[PDB]
A paper describes a structure:
We here-report work carried out on PilO2Bp, a component of the Tfpb R64 thin pilus variant assembly machinery from B. pseudomallei. We show that N-PilO2Bp consists of two α/β sub-domains separated by a prominent central cleft, typical of actin-like ATPases. The function of PilO2 within the Tfpb assembly machinery is not documented, however, PilO2 is reported to be an assembly protein that localizes in the cytoplasm in the absence of other Pil proteins, translocating to the OM in their presence. FFPred, from the PSIPRED website, predicted the most plausible topology, with a cytoplasmic localization for the N-terminal domain (1-194), a transmembrane domain (195-214), and a periplasmic localization for the C-terminal domain (215-432).
Although the crystal structure of N-PilO2Bp displays one protein chain per asymmetric unit, inspection of crystal packing highlights three differently packed ‘dimers’. The second crystal packing dimer is built around an ‘anchor loop’ that covers residues 168-179. This loop was refined with higher than average B-factors, suggesting conformational flexibility that may mediate PilO2Bp interaction/recognition with other assembly machinery partners. Due to even higher flexibility, in the absence of phosphate it was not possible to model the anchor loop structure into continuous electron density. The conformational flexibility of the loop thus appears to be dependent on intermolecular interactions. In fact, in the absence of the phosphate ion the two protein molecules (paired through crystal packing) move apart, in keeping with the increased unit cell size. On the other hand, the stabilization of the (otherwise flexible) ‘anchor loop’ built by residues 169-179 is obtained thanks to intermolecular interactions that occur in a region characterized by positively charged residues, suggesting its potential role in the assembly with other (macro)molecular partners.
Author numbering: 4 to 169, 178 to 187
Write the structure that this text describes.
Amino acid sequence: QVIQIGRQRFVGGLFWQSLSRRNELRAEAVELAKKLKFDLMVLRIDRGVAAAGYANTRDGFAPGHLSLGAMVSRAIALEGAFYNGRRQPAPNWLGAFALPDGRWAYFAVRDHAFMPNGDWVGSREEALERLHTDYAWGGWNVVIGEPELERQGFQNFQPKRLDDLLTERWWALRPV
Ligand SMILES: [K+]
Ligand SMILES: [K+]
Ligand SMILES: [K+]
Ligand SMILES: [K+]
Ligand SMILES: [K+]
Ligand SMILES: [K+]
Ligand SMILES: [K+]
């Protein structure tokens, strides 16, 4: 299900795979898509990360769909986060955001990379359940998300709406 944000079509629900950094990154990503059985990919390569985000046409994904996760994770990697009265990098963060159409997005990032299923879209209800479940593992710098999550009483929380974080060519899904 595309997520329409302004006149752009975004997607959640990619499967995130960290890459070895040892071989040609693109060729490694392709070979892993073949083993994991995915026909679409995005490639996230910056100083903080070498990772591929995968999807299948059969699940309703298509070339040209933009990765919402890629966009959000980039934006936090650049800005960092505000908590404890300080501006600091947030390599380990989790969050949930209202999308314009009423669905919610859930994100779980460690060392500036997505956890394998840390990019999810569905109901508010289930986004919160996913957030708490991952939260229990610990090692999280901050929860970043919809201002109403303050009432969850996480130790470190930064209110943030998706609008505040909003593209780059690399976000678009392409054939493997
Ligand atoms: K991985
Ligand atoms: K993975
Ligand atoms: K995504
Ligand atoms: K995995
Ligand atoms: K997995
Ligand atoms: K996960
Ligand atoms: K952990």
